[PDB]
């Protein structure tokens, strides 16, 4: 059994657990051995993970960068060891990558901003909780969101990173609420931060604020159905992991693949 390795940015996020299960289920199906390594949002740890795999008989490296610019060293190391690299969910700015599989994050941010304008109205006062700064996902969602801003003349009271983390998303929202109690809507770049923000508005008695997340995880989807979360942009993590293993199979077979494989997004609301 050829071994395929999956280096995921973190496992302390439901989105990445689903991504891992999708890859795992497809690996079982195609008869591969899947090794899963966790970088814990640490580029130094990612590098150590990749260096350890290049001598384990790893045939293909599926990688979710902790940082789109910093991952280039790990990619170049996989290149040196003649191990083809496929990026999942986030890009590698440089380094030789056979294929990239991800959602259209620029579209995702605009759609998020457009839904806010539809509910909170044009010229609405918003706060944006951003993801991990150096990743392509956060960067692109912000750009897409900046398009809805200009178009809907939104007044952005504040925009700040909460690192795709639920607890950080809670503390950052907590701190911003004290300074900006007039907030009407919040765009949270993932469901974890969106759920943290919700808890902050809860602790503050500020139930009037409209929160839009991203991912459509089990928790994110439930909060929308319970009426707490206004909407989330559903991604298909399991299919990104599966498509990644599927593509790793073709490369090993000698079949050429596309340099990019998009995955569908879907606005999620109650009913
Ligand atoms: O797309 C992924 C998911 O949104 C995850 O929740 C955080 O990292 C992003 O890159």
Swiss-Prot record:
GO CC, alphabetical: ATP-binding cassette (ABC) transporter complex, substrate-binding subunit-containing; membrane; outer membrane-bounded periplasmic space
A biological process from GO: D-ribose transmembrane transport
CDD domains: PBP1_ribose_binding
Domain of life: Bacteria
Example of a GO MF term: monosaccharide binding
Sorted UniProt keywords: Chemotaxis, Periplasm, Signal, Sugar transport, Transport
PANTHER family linked: D-ALLOSE-BINDING PERIPLASMIC PROTEIN-RELATED
Task performed by this protein: Part of the ABC transporter complex RbsABC involved in ribose import. Binds ribose. Also serves as the primary chemoreceptor for chemotaxis.
Subunit: The complex is composed of an ATP-binding protein (RbsA), two transmembrane proteins (RbsC) and a solute-binding protein (RbsB).
Family: Belongs to the bacterial solute-binding protein 2 family.
Protein name, entry field: Ribose import binding protein RbsB
Source organism per UniProt: Escherichia coli (strain K12)
Primary gene name: rbsB
């Amino acid at each position: 059994k050829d071994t395929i390795a999956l280096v995921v940015s973190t496992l302390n996020n439901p989105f990445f657990v689903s991504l891992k299960d999708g890859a795992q289920k497809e690996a079982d199906k195609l008869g591969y051995n899947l090794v899963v390594l966790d970088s814990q949002n640490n580029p130094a740890k990612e590098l150590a993970n990749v260096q350890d795999l290049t001598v384990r008989g790893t045939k293909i490296l599926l990688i979710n960068p902790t940082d789109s610019d910093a991952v280039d060293n790990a990619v170049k190391m996989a290149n040196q060891a003649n191990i083809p690299v496929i990026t999942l969910d986030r890009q590698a700015t440089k380094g030789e990558v056979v294929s990239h599989i991800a959602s259209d994050n620029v579209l995702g941010g605009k759609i998020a901003g457009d839904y806010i304008a539809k509910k909170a109205g044009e010229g609405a006062k918003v706060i944006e909780l951003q993801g991990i700064a150096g990743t392509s996902a956060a960067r692109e969602r912000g750009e897409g969101f900046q398009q809805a801003v200009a178009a809907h003349k939104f007044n952005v009271l504040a925009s700040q990173p909460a690192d795709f983390d639920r607890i950080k998303g809670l503390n950052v929202m907590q701190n911003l609420l004290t300074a900006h109690p007039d907030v009407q809507a919040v765009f949270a770049q993932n469901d974890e931060m969106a759920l943290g923000a919700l808890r902050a508005l809860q602790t503050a008695g500020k139930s009037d604020v409209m929160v839009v997340g991203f991912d459509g995880t089990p928790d994110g989807e439930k909060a929308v159905n319970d009426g707490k979360l206004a909407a989330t942009i559903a991604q298909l993590p399991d299919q990104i992991g599966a498509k990644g293993v599927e593509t790793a199979d073709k490369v090993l077979k000698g079949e050429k693949v596309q340099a990019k494989y998009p995955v569908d997004l879907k606005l999620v609301v109650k009913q």
